[PDB]
Swiss-Prot record, chain A:
It comes from the Eukaryota. It catalyses: FMNH2 + NADP(+) = FMN + NADPH + 2 H(+); FMNH2 + NAD(+) = FMN + NADH + 2 H(+). One of its GO terms (molecular function) is FMN binding. This is NAD(P)H-dependent FMN reductase LOT6. Induction: Induced by low temperature and by cycloheximide. One of its GO terms (cellular component) is cytoplasm. Present with 1270 molecules/cell in log phase SD medium. Homodimer.
Amino acid sequence: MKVGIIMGSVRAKRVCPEIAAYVKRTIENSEELIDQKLKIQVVDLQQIALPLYEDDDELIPAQIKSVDEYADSKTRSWSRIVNALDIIVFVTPQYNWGYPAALKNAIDRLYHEWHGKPALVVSYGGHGGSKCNDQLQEVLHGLKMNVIGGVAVKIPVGTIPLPEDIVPQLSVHNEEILQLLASCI
Amino acid sequence: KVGIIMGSVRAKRVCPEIAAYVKRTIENSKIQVVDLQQIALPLYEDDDELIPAQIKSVDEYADSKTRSWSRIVNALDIIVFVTPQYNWGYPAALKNAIDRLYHEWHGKPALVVSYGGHGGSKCNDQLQEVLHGLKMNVIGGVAVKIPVGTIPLPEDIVPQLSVHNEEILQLLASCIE
Ligand SMILES: Cc1cc2nc3c(=O)[nH]c(=O)nc-3n(C[C@H](O)[C@H](O)[C@H](O)COP(=O)(O)O)c2cc1C
Ligand SMILES: Cc1cc2nc3c(=O)[nH]c(=O)nc-3n(C[C@H](O)[C@H](O)[C@H](O)COP(=O)(O)O)c2cc1C
Ligand SMILES: [Ca+2]
Ligand SMILES: [Ca+2]
């Protein structure tokens, strides 16, 4: 079944891909999970480029029951991508003790596509991005997602790309990410 | 100098009515209703590679739209965030605008007037935490209940928004001095 790794950052130079790459390759090389052949998709919101100010729909997304009911075509396309996901791993930075606007914008554009789906929040920042993790988990709860958990990944702020010597040390989180993902499958 | 920053940029929106309620609530005891639709700070288009916390003055911003946005914000004395609650959180348009600046928020008093089916209290809490992180002097927050799905608001509801007069006025008059 499909695992969507949704990146939160859309900054031109950013750490998000490195974290998303770690999460992808952690699931892939996992011994428990090599058998369940999960298919993995890294979703780049910089590439989707979901508009902030233009939105043809005037109905609340909760009021929308299916994809064809959306007046907006860019929403419908984003609706398909997310609907095709069975498990979602949000890989997100923390901006000012909160979640990035690009991620919140994309999350808020949809509704029924999130329902009941397991969601793991992998945050990152100077102190793991714990405050963003906390906040985003609550937004996922509001969407009635099955919030598996949240892992907070410490990085050295200001250093892109990550040092050679810290990349290996991301793998301290391997056991928790895998125990959480596996018991869900 | 008091700025009422609207959080919603939806085409059909309740936000301007609540901003109007807050405005006329104040001046019925120097306002500026800021519209982020009109300011139109881009979500994706950043010239700036510099994190706004590293920026010591407006000039360092490589972005023209950011410099003007800084100008507007840095000028203000008191800020009242009038914001809806989207899925137990704050709107992206408001978070995007907030995150583009840093030093301009330092020490500024800020009151959050949220709204929603139950006053948008969850958004109010979440936004206050972000404001705390920007080292703003957070007065507090007031949750304004609305009927949801009817825009503009049912006319009978607009007067009864004034239940929140006491609290907004109490919280505001204290900070004035
Ligand atoms: C707008 C802004 C806000 C930030 N806020 C925080 C924060 O509150 N806590 C933290 O630990 N790092 C914060 N950072 C530093 C980020 O951890 C760092 O820039 C990281 O690279 C952001 O992730 P990204 O490169 O994938 O966008 C912030 C950076 C910027 C851009
Ligand atoms: C993205 C989306 C999610 C929403 N989530 C909530 C919700 O979590 N709780 C709530 O009380 N209202 C929620 N609202 C309903 C709003 O209260 C109502 O639509 C309001 O008019 C939105 O404010 P605005 O018109 O100024 O943008 C949501 C609205 C939208 C657009
Ligand atoms: Ca917590
Ligand atoms: Ca919490």
